[PDB]
Amino acid sequence: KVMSITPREELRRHFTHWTWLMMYGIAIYFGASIITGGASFLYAKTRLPTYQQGLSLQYLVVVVGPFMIGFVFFGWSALGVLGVINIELGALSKLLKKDLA
Amino acid sequence: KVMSITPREELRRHFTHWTWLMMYGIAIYFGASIITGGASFLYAKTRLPTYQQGLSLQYLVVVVGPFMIGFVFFGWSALGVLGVINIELGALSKLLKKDLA
Amino acid sequence: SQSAVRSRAEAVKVSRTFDYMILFTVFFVVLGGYHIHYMLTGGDWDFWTDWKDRRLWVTVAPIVSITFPAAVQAVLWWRYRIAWGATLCVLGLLLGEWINRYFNFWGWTYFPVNFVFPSNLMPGAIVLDVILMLSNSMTLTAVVGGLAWGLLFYPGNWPIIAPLHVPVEYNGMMMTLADLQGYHYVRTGTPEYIRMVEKGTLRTFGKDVAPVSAFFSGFVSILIYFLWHFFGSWFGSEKFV
Amino acid sequence: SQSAVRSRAEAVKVSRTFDYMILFTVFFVVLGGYHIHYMLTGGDWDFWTDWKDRRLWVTVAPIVSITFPAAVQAVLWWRYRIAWGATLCVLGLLLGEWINRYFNFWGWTYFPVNFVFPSNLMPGAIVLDVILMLSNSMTLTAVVGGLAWGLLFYPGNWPIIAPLHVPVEYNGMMMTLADLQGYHYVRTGTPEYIRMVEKGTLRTFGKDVAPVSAFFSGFVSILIYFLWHFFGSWFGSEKFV
Amino acid sequence: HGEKSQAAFMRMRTIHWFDLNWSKDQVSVNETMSISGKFHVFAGWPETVDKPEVAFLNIGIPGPVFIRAGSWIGGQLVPRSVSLELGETYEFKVLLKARRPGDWHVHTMMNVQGGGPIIGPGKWVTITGSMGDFKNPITTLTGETIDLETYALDGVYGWHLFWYLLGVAWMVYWCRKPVFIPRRIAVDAGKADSLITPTDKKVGMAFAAGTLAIVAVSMGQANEKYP
Ligand SMILES: OC[C@H]1O[C@H](O[C@H]2[C@H](O)[C@@H](O)[C@H](OCCCCCC3CCCCC3)O[C@@H]2CO)[C@H](O)[C@@H](O)[C@@H]1O
Ligand SMILES: OC[C@H]1O[C@H](O[C@H]2[C@H](O)[C@@H](O)[C@H](OCCCCCC3CCCCC3)O[C@@H]2CO)[C@H](O)[C@@H](O)[C@@H]1O
Ligand SMILES: OC[C@H]1O[C@H](O[C@H]2[C@H](O)[C@@H](O)[C@H](OCCCCCC3CCCCC3)O[C@@H]2CO)[C@H](O)[C@@H](O)[C@@H]1O
Ligand SMILES: [Cu+2]
């Protein structure tokens, strides 16, 4: 029952989602020098109104990979982060537009 | 304001359009022995009711080329002329059907 | 009603000035296209008599050349019951080839025209056009036309080249006259190994090599025809973006 | 209305904590991605000074590296008028390369840092970002940017490597200092023939070889840019399944 | 011309041309000349030049201003491509016969498949006369003594002009009538069968059956004049 939450709470959670998306970005960096990729996608669908009508495409690319059809594909998959950024801000933009007029 | 012109004037212009499409056909022949490819597409969109809801696909092929995705593609692109023919006549056919009953 | 013309007669003069301008255009534009395509795919066997063999030339030239006909037929026949589809193309090619062999190959670099004359595609272009006009069926034109296009290619050319296939004992080695032409008229930038003519196999029987190749060319030619009809339909499209 | 915040000031503190967390994320995730892509396509010329030649390196490195910029520009510029698109990427790469050359190539296997220093991509990343911010047109950025990205790659690197192109009469044979570095610092698992540097042709003229390659790289770079802009737009998509 | 543009080390490290002899350096149309000499296939042949397993002894001239009446390596006629081998020294002769008056910088040369043109030294040779003098006689194994500079040329011009005009026919059989706007209207309006009449319908069968007939017979008539 978390598609009706106090706007202050929803935002507190988009804050937690980015703690996951940040830790994930570290794992991805130590990768080129998989756990959190679920810990985050879960959260965004578990506990966030914006991601409730069923899994983001580009959020998937960021976690699946070439497993949608070499390892350069795992590389190109990182650009999926633009889709998650585009969603999150569009969501945050709507929650704080007011507010910043 | 040239989607409401005297049927005699519209036809006078489809006449000019084919003066461009003819000169272009010469350039294409001296090619296999780019200017007019704009001078014509422009006209058809500038000054001709038939080409007003936004650029013909196959008219584009005739001017773009492989730049929609060797040089055999520039060759296969000439067959785009069938699309422009098909449009022009369908337009002229409607303007003179009457008239030829 | 309102009229673009001021007399029934004017409506017939205009509807036939357009016939010329369009004829002119679709002739030259498709020339340029068809000629470029054919120069880069089949063009190499088409330049020299000592490339016109029985294996490769018999295969390549029909397959590559049936394309544009099947494209132009696709629009002209079904949109206008126009039945010179294949022939407008083959007319355009040969005109373009011939101007290039006479005024350039021979014209400016002195190759004997009887070394650089083109292939002859026009028999198949008539049997194709007609088989389509009769029957009015893309499929029968693909199957019966495709086989026609390939099987006719070497016959339609053998009366021209056959003179050059009489053998010769030149400085100790058997050569055909075509081979002699290649040896003689020095192609500085086209040395011998570039030439892809039949050379024999241990898995092969010699003549017949030409008929067997002609049929293979016929079958692939029907596949090329299906493909290139749909490609032509696509090409004849009045959709806007 | 109801508010996530309890004061206009809070709404500005939050909307700028997010700026950091997102900056951090899109910096490191695109690092990882871009670095992996670049390591497997261009990475081999990028490790060693005696692979940084005039034919291949000049060609490969721009083409492979312009990708991710064109992807990241596609989203950041048009969704947010963000204009450090190419530079976030090239910053991320070089940071990733440099940590790897210093603490590993030199760090743990003792290769002299002046043997394993990276390519320099940042001049094109600025000329690219700016050409896009001015003009705000994907096409002009593709054509004028693509040529910019390739033509600038060797100039942006020649002041660094040129020291290593002074020749040397070593044990009887002319070698550049770069060649000496390769001969000297033993790459047990990367022997000489693996290296794809220019070697000459009979159809070729020598220097100029670098400018001619740089332009070719420029042209292919615009094609790669069109492609990778659309790929980026695709990548920046909020569609749900 | 053309070899000053090639990499210097290529030309030094590839084929060495030496002891060349030119039997003339002015010649009249039909007068033959002889370039002969030796060449060495340098055993340290460049990487990016395929070893000459498949090479061809050409001459460099702008078009057949000469014709190559002969060429030999090792006293074997080499009209086809040869295998040369790194390390070895070969002798050669080419028999040029002049065709087109002018001042020609004649290069002896070696095309190496997978390699490029390996260009030997050229000396100016001057042809005098009128090219219309040029004659290229051949005695066939059926003999018959032909001139290969014009043989079968009336047959090509014949048969090509026929089939072209046969084509122009088909196109003017129809462009007699109106082609585009009226046929368009006719087809759209549901009336497409109205445009192929039964005269039309097998005027068509004429051209078809004719083209096949003219093919099969002149086919059979060719395997007679040349059995
Ligand atoms: O800063 C004051 C804010 O406090 C609350 O939100 C906090 C949250 O309670 C707070 O828990 C959270 O903190 C973000 C810390 C980010 C973790 C950083 C890294 C940890 C290690 C490496 C990766 C991530 O985000 C907000 C502040 O950034 C309120 O919800 C906000 O409205 C209020 O403005
Ligand atoms: O022929 C009489 C007609 O005059 C007017 O249209 C003219 C136009 O005023 C006239 O300017 C134009 O002329 C077409 C000439 C075609 C140019 C031919 C080539 C020039 C050089 C090489 C390429 C093209 O087309 C029409 C005649 O074909 C009227 O509009 C017509 O209704 C009327 O029937
Ligand atoms: O002479 C009397 C006839 O002339 C007029 O029609 C002419 C037309 O006015 C006349 O212009 C037309 O010409 C046909 C050939 C013109 C294009 C020739 C080819 C160019 C090369 C390749 C194919 C087409 O032929 C028709 C009949 O021969 C009348 O309109 C006809 O009704 C009448 O039957
Ligand atoms: Cu010379």
Q: Where are the beta strands (DSSP E) in E99-222?
A: 102-112, 116-128, 137-139, 145-147
Sequence spans of domains, chain C: 1-241
How far is residue C48's CA from residue C179's CA, in Å, rounded to a whole number? 10
Helix, coil or strand: residue E95: strand
Q: What Cα–Cα distance (Å) separates residue B89 from each residue in A42, C1, C166?
A: 59, 20, 53
D68 neighbourhood in chain A, CB within 8 Å: 79
Nearest-CA residue of chain E relative to C112?
A: E149
Distance D206 CA to ligand 4 centre (A): 20
Cβ proximity of D122 and D77 under 8 Å: no
- Contact flag C5-B15 (C-beta cutoff 8 Å): no
Chain C residues whose beta carbon lies within 8 Å of the beta carbon of residue E201: 133-134
How many Å apart are CA A40 and CA A52, to the nearest integer?
14
Domains and CATH numbers, chain E: 1-135 (2.60.120.570), 136-227 (1.10.287.710)
Ligand 3 atom nearest the C-alpha of E168 is 22
For residues E41 and E110, the answer to whether their CB atoms sit within 8 Å is no
Give dist(CA C37, CA C32) in Å, integer: 9
- How many CA within 13 A on the CB side of residue D13? 8
**Ligand 1 site, CB within 6 A:** A 12, 15, 19, 22-23; D 5, 10, 13-14, 17
Among D178, D197, D183, D180, smallest CA distance to D57 is for D197
Residues D201, E14: C-beta atoms closer than 8 Å: no
Which one of E183, E185, E191 makes the best mutation probe of the B interface by having the most chain B beta carbons within 10 Å? Answer: E185
Q: Chain A closest CA to D175's CA: distance in Å?
A: 33
Distance CA A69, CA D232 (A): 19
Q: Do E182 and B100 touch (CB under 8 A)?
A: yes
Of C194, D124, A8, C164, nearest in space to E80 by CA: C194
Chain C residues with CB-CB distance to B87 below 8 A: 238
Residue B27 CB–ligand 2 contact under 6 Å: no
Q: Is E40 annotated as a binding residue?
A: yes
Of D199, D205, D206, the CB nearest to E48: D199
Is residue E219 classed exposed, middle or buried when 0-12, 13-18 and 19+ CB atoms within 10 A define those classes?
middle
Q: Does D40 touch chain A (CB under 8 A)?
A: yes
Residues lining ligand 4 (ion), CB within 5 A? E 1, 105, 122
Bridge partner residues of E77 (DSSP): E72
For the CA of A19, the closest atom of ligand 1 is 24
Helices (H), D81-209: 85-100, 122-133, 138-140, 146-151, 158-161, 177-184
Q: How far is the CA of A56 from the centre of ligand 1 (A)?
A: 25
CA dihedral sign, ordered D70, D72, D77, D81: negative
D202 to E6: CB separation less than 8 angstroms, yes or no: yes
CA nearest neighbour of D157 among D222, D62, D83: D62
Identity of residue B5: I
What residue ranges in chain D does DSSP mark as E strands? 167-170, 173-176
3-state secondary structure of E38: strand
- Locate A2 and state its tokens: 């978390």
Can you tell me the distance from the alpha carbon of C74 to that of C64, in angstroms, rounded to the nearest whole number? 17
Contacts with C127 from chain E: Cβ below 8 Å: 208, 211-212
Residues 6+ apart with CB under 8 A from E209: none
Give the domain range for residue B29: 1-101
If phi > 0 it is left, if psi is from -120 to 50 it is alpha, else beta; for residue D191 that is beta
Nearest listed ligand to the Cα of residue E4: 4
Helix (H) or strand (E) holding A40: helix A36-46
Go through E150-171 and write b for each residue having 16 or more CB atoms within 10 A of its CB, e for each that does not. ebbbebbeebbeebbebbeebb
The residue in chain E having the minimum alpha-carbon distance to the alpha carbon of residue C120 is E160
Phi, psi at D58, each rounded to 5°: -60, -35
What dotted CATH number matches C1-241? 1.20.1450.10
Report the domain count for chain B: 1
Q: Which resolution, in Å, applies to this structure?
A: 2.7
- B22/B17 Cα distance (integer angstroms): 9
Instruction: Tell me how crowded residue E198 is: count the other CB atoms within 10 A of its CB.
Output: 7
CB pairs under 8 A between D and E: 32
Answer yes or no: are the C-beta atoms of A17 and A81 closer than 8 Å.
no
Chain centroid to CA B46: 12
Contacts of B12 (CB under 8 A, 6+ apart): none
Report the SS3 class of residue D117. coil
Partner residues linked to E138 by β-bridges: E146
Of the candidates D240, D236, D239, the residue with the CA atom closest to the CA atom of residue D228: D236
DSSP class of A79? G
Within 10 angstroms of residue C218's Cβ, the number of other Cβ atoms is 23
Instruction: Report the candidate in E183, C99, D216 with the shortest Cα–Cα distance to residue B93.
Output: E183
Omega into C208 within 30° of 0, i.e. cis?
yes
Dihedrals φ, ψ of E92, to 5°? Answer: -145, 155
Is residue C174 exposed (0-12), middle (13-18) or buried (19+ Cβ within 10 Å)? Answer: exposed
Q: Is D41 left (phi over 0), alpha (psi -120 to 50) or beta?
A: alpha
What CA–CA distance (Å, rounded) separates D34 from A74? 10
Residue nearest to atom 7 of ligand 2 (CA): B12
Question: Which among E64, E149, E155 has the least Cβ separation from residue C163?
Answer: E155
What pairs with residue D164 in β-bridges? none
What distance, in Å, lies between the first and last C-alpha atoms of chain A?
A: 31
Number of the ligand 3 atom closest to the C-alpha atom of C84:
23
Pocket lining for ligand 3, CB < 6 angstroms: E 168, 171-172, 175-176
End-to-end CA distance of chain E: 45
**Rounded to the nearest whole angstrom, what is the distance from the C-alpha of residue C17 to the centroid of ligand 4?**
54
Which ligand is located closest to the Cα atom of residue B29? 2
Could you give phi then psi for residue E127, rounded to 5 degrees? Answer: -105, 140
Alpha-carbon gap, residue D216 to D63, rounded angstroms:
10
**A82 with D241: Cβ contact below 8 A:** no
Ligand 3 atom with the smallest distance to the CA of E177 is 26
DSSP string, chain C: ---SSSSHHHHHHHHHHHHHHHHHHHHHHHHHHHHHHHHHHTHHHHH-TTT--SSHHHHHHHHHHSHHHHHHHHHHHHHH----HHHHHHHHHHHHHHHHIIIIIITTT---TTTSPPP--HHHHHHHHHHHHTT--HHHIIIIIHHHHHHTTTTTTHHHHGGGGSEEEETTEEEEHHHHHHHHS--TTS-GGG-------SS--SSSSHHHHHHHHHHHHHHHHHHHHHHHHHHS---B-
Q: Tell me the HSE value of D138 on the side-chain side, using a 13 A CA sphere.
A: 20
Which atom of ligand 2 is least distant from the CA of C6?
32
Residue C214, burial from CB neighbour count under 10 angstroms (0-12, 13-18, 19+):
buried
CA distance A93 to A85: 11
In DSSP terms, E106 is beta-bridged to E123
User: What kind and span of H or E run contains A4?
Assistant: none
Quick one: which H or E segment has residue E1?
none
CA of B50 to the centre of ligand 2 (A): 20
Taking CA–CA distances from A90, the nearest residue in chain D reads: D238
CB contact under 8 A, A29 and D28: yes
Q: Tell me if E16 is assigned to a ligand binding site.
A: yes
Q: Which residues pair with E97 in a beta bridge?
A: E32, E67
**Nearest CA among C240, C239, C237, C241 for reference residue C75:** C237
Reduce the DSSP state of residue D153 to 3 states and report it. coil
Whether D131 contacts D140, CB under 8 Å: yes
- Both tokens assigned to C126: 């008539």
Q: Give the residues across from E40 on adjacent strands.
A: E16, E89
- Tell me which of E176, E177, E179, E180 to substitute to probe ligand 3's pocket, judged by most ligand atoms within 8 Å of the beta carbon: E176
DSSP strand pairing (E66-73 vs E116-128): unpaired
Cβ-defined contact of E64 to C159 (cutoff 8 Å): no
CA–CA separation, C113 and C105 (whole Å): 8
